[PDB]
Specification:
This is part of a larger assembly, with eight copies of chain A. Chain A is mostly beta strands. Chain A contains one helix and eleven strands; from the N terminus they run ββββαβββββββ. It is classed as virus.
């Protein structure tokens, strides 16, 4: 009984982040909401991405009504598609604080950074998962202050010279937010 | 046991005063109540009330507006507000009816506050509105009617959070 | 000794359903009845399915003379066929309560949602199984009322542009129902 | 000292119904109101009935001001009249959940179902009573939800070919409702 | 408080059947399912019935998805109709194992065999019940083999020479089946 | 819950019978066989009967293969028919040893003897049973010797002057024989 | 537990010698076995054998008669008696074959003795006979073939004892 | 040290079978004989099979001299051949009682039922084994009675449209019989 998923965990090191301390008072009600957002439909052409998790669609729409939001889990997962066995694609991945000035072109120059050869019929095709070492990030994705080290995802893709008709792999980012303290705004929508 | 959150809300339910009108909103479906419970499997009202905001026109054009809270399953209609228990008829734009906190709390204890569940309920709160305007109509609406409250929600509905 | 079975378990979270308890009294006896039903014969063309397990024919057929019935277990199985090796085909799977408004076109945007490449590269031919997190659903499939959060399966197929001559994978839904309390109708048929 | 009433009790079997559980809080005030409604004036012509107790006149008028109502007792009683000794009438009776798809034409095909020969001077003429096995029904005649198994009465009459001048037997349904939680509506009438 | 039910119990003796025991192992769960089926609408003409309960439609319909099923209880009920008072009709009843070669024409020659005058004189209109001495039968109605001594009902009607306009009594067979062990077939229908 | 049978037991007195004593040796295997034989189809005309139970059809065919046979129970039962409510019939019954020289014309002159008015719509119509006081008879219906006091049934019928179209009541004799010691004869049939 | 009785029997199964013949009787159906078990739900054989009675003609007309007991489910045929285990071929009317107790016991332990039950059995006793007569046939039969035994029966079948 | 065999076990559920109880007496001598029979040479054309294990060649020839035979183990095993890497073949398998009315066309509609993609160079090629859940069958392959639930094998094959020159996989059925009580027959051969 094998599981259809593979892991390629990021090299870590200790690097703490500070964070606005809790205000004295009774503990506030908090909810947790899981999420999965499409971050990229790669394979057809070289392309790079540099997402600041704090701002991805789900994370955004989820945290609009709260004044505080922290990531409890968060990982990136590469999903090969039907075009994958036929069009190997190089996919680079690296988690860094929003404050790190690294660009996807620098993934192989950045400690955590790694690149994978998704696809190739000689190869595997199982969903690749690179969990973000949140310990190294600043989990607070929304607070009363703006932290400089929220997690940031660096993606890099180099497609086959004779491109596949379609994307070889969809790239999604999933995680769970723990939020609380409602932000008074318009709930019309 | 499941973690719950509370989110407050105020939705515009009806702009009025320019013409006679009736309304029967089941508050379980008002815009905000809907956008709020989108990602939850269960939602219930903690507090809930109707409020009448008078405007510029109000003074010049008195308006008769009646409200009445009732279990969604109550057969009563706007035409029967003063015949119903909750029932109240105000004269907005009128002597002591051109002030914002023209509030009418909903007796949730008198009805079913669950507005979202694994099952469909028959007695959720329902609002009745009955506006009767000046025959010689105002240029604009004499008062905005909104429904405010607090939802206690829990258990995430697994849908699309793209938006 | 390996098992020709592969698991691609769905991400979970905690969501509870509401279920009516029986009026106090003598407990009725219960029987379990297993079932397997075809859901789709995908592969030859892009397609999408969206079924509510509660309404599957077998579930109906089986619970006919019982007033109460719940899902003891339930899962999806993607069965690659002889056409699969040559025609890698994308298959998207996601279990969701009947009340979730997501559509197959949104699998990869929904928390649990999965994308699989059937056939093609190494390891792509074993039967895939995505068990339904019944814990996250509302198992009651037949009761004194109708629930809104019964399990609902979402499927999405993306076929090879130059279509295979036949379907590349048969998709069935299997499980066990536990039921009781005789519906007193006319049993002549 | 004999009692002027006869009983023809329905064959039963265990079949529970589920029911919306009580909300936490202090027990609400409840009243009980007995009732007897005329359900049929039979004898003059073949006729069938299919009453859903939840909706009979008394049950309806009684429960208008309450938000919850449950049957505590409920039976059907056949009353022979002066036309009865002279015009025997076949009368079929069967209690089933509202959800059972049986029709009066199917009483003799339905487990509980029974038919009696009311009238005939050679016979008895005492009021016949078929108490409804509420245990088999769903007693909740009015709640915050609509149950599918409230009790339903199936009546069937086949009159003498040369019909009596008047009905041979009046058929009433009596019972007791336990109600509570006032429904705010118009009490003008 | 009298019951509108009359019993005319069958003479018994001791005869045992042979029944296959299950192979040792975990006990399967069992459910009971009650049933009532029409057997005859006698009265208008001399007639005779001879049915093997094992084959009754309800028994079939109910045991469809089970490999094993036995009769928990089972009886015949003669229901006089409005025509009965005026058209006394002879009804013969006798329970006998499927293997007994007797015929309705031999009820009064067979040990258990009974002859009843439905309608006519005082007391002739209450529903008659002849419970089947299951003890003398072989209750197994569905097994791994077929038994030869399942219960078989014999009926014989002798109508009034100047026939009634309609049947004088409806004859149904009621009982309870206890079954278990899923027949693993195709449940799509 | 009333039983559809009436009893009209015979006046008794002590009168023993002697009987061939058991031969010394091991107890022989014995079986018991119940039986019901038609003894008369009365009602259409005055008629009398004088059966020697030892020789009635069933008793005869049952005991052919045994050398010893004794009655363990034995009674006569009058069954009214559809012609009965309309044609009251006088039926006389009396059990006597074969040795008593009484004739049916002498039933009302013989101690046990009784006569009943079967039929009449004003009357009852339940099966009449006159159990034979075997204590007064000589139960040995077949032995190595011929007893003079085996039971003998005396029947007498006086029909309505304007006779019914058919018999008003069938008269059967039922009982149980305990037999043993096979008689070597032809079993061809 | 149920009281049982035993009844012995001898049924004529075949008169022979006047012409070649084969026979395959399943003894569960022979006349007496049938008339005997008529009023019983269960019947089983205690003893059982075939016997060959020679006659007047026997001496003048030797006859070859072979018998063989076999489970009803045995596919063997009369043509294969000397190939089957029970198998025996006699020369009736022949030197040491014109004597009554020309018996051939049936090995019940080698088969299923139940001849009447709630279920149908496949291996009840079955007899195979193979007569081969003189080409110049006898006026009458040279030997009568009968099947005898004992039945142990119990549990009354409720039928008609009129006869 | 890996084993050259793979397992694809059938979904089971509890379903007992009854069986003729052992006759009282001394335990009989019994032997066990293992066996492997060729059941199909598939791959060159769509084909289905529906074997009743009780009758396959080996099982037959093995049990001819015994009166009782039971399966102690029994499984089906798919053997890919040299034509397999090049001609993927869909192979469906399902074990059901002989009494289940399912046809190979209904394997994917039957609970146990499964289909595999044998062959494809991208794939595995190890012998597939689907052990029969005898617990669900009636192991008695030969007795004094004919059981309705002996095991039955359902095979289904769909070959490549442009068929391989030869069969892609041989399908054999192996097991062990425990037999006893010799059946007297002709041993000439």
């Amino acid at each position: 009984m094998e599981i259809d998923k593979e892991l390629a965990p990021q090299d870590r090191t200790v690097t703490v982040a500070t964070v606005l301390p809790a205000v004295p008072g009774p503990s506030p009600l908090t909810i947790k909401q899981p999420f999965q957002s499409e971050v990229l439909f790669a394979g057809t052409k070289d392309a790079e991405a540099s997402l600041t998790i704090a701002n991805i669609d789900s994370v955004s729409t989820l945290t609009t009504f709260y004044r505080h939001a922290s990531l409890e889990s968060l990982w990136v997962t590469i999903h090969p598609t039907l075009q994958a066995p036929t069009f190997p694609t190089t996919v680079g991945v690296c988690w860094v604080p929003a404050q790190s000035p690294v660009t996807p072109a620098q993934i192989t120059k950045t400690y955590g950074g790694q690149i994978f050869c998704i696809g190739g019929a000689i190869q595997t095709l199982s969903p690749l998962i690179v969990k973000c070492p949140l310990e190294m990030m600043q989990p607070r994705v929304k607070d009363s202050i703006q932290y400089l080290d929220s997690p940031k995802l660096l993606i890099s893709i180099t497609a086959q010279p004779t491109a596949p008709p379609a994307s070889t792999c969809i790239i999604t980012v999933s995680g769970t937010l723990s939020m609380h303290s409602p932000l008074i705004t318009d709930t019309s929508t």
